[PDB]
């Protein structure tokens, strides 16, 4: 090969995505999580915000590890699975409520 | 339609990182000093946002990852507790 020009746009798309990500992160972190929870009364709404927070951090850690050139994504993949597990419990709970 | 911009943005980053990772980045990173640099900056940019999330919660590599496992554990327990309480109130 020796041709880097093909590799560069991959990065640009990545950087573009990161810039796009920042404002959203600032919105999320505009208040501490605990302060956000207080601003909620619905237990359901609370569970949602938390699962979301777990999702973003895990994903951002995942993306980090990929770019680092980490071969093995299993520790993050394992944690990501665990998060899905808890997100799954949230939904099945909803179904139980619906039937109720 | 309640669409989540944040989650959509998060996914774009993962795709972008992943797509980036598929290339022989190590080959170019080692080949070109200029490339290595920007790349670290973008990763740091990604790193900055992730630590900001951690700063929001506020509850050596070995020593480091261990620390990450600890935060995920903190988040997931709050969640389990939230779930346990809904299940209890129903029951």
């Amino acid at each position: 090969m020796e041709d880097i020009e093909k590799i560069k746009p991959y990065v640009r798309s990545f950087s573009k995505a990161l810039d796009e990500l920042k404002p959203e992160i600032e919105k999320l972190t505009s208040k501490s999580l605990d302060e956000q929870l207080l601003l909620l009364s619905d237990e359901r709404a609370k569970l949602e915000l938390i699962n979301r927070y777990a999702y973003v951090l895990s994903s951002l850690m995942f993306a980090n590890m990929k770019v680092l050139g980490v071969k093995d994504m299993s520790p993050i993949l394992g944690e990501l699975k665990r998060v899905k597990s808890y997100m799954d419990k949230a939904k099945q709970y909803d179904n139980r409520i619906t039937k109720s | 339609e309640n669409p989540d911009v944040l989650l959509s943005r998060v996914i774009n980053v993962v795709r972008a990182a992943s797509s980036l990772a598929s290339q022989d980045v190590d080959f170019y990173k080692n080949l070109d000093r200029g490339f290595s640099k920007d790349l670290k900056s973008k990763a740091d940019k990604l790193a900055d946002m992730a630590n900001e999330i951690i700063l929001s919660i506020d509850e050596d590599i070995s020593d480091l990852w261990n620390n990450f496992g600890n935060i995920m554990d903190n988040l997931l327990e709050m969640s389990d507790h939230s779930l346990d309480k809904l299940n209890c109130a129903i029951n």
Binding site: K6, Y55, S59, F62, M73, L77, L80, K84 | L7, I11, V14, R15, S18, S19, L20, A21, S22, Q23
Partner: peptide, 14 residues
């Protein structure tokens, strides 16, 4: 739709 699919899917490498 599943959010986690993004982890599995293959990149658009040249």
């Amino acid at each position: 739709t599943d959010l986690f699919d993004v982890f599995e899917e293959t990149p658009v490498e040249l």
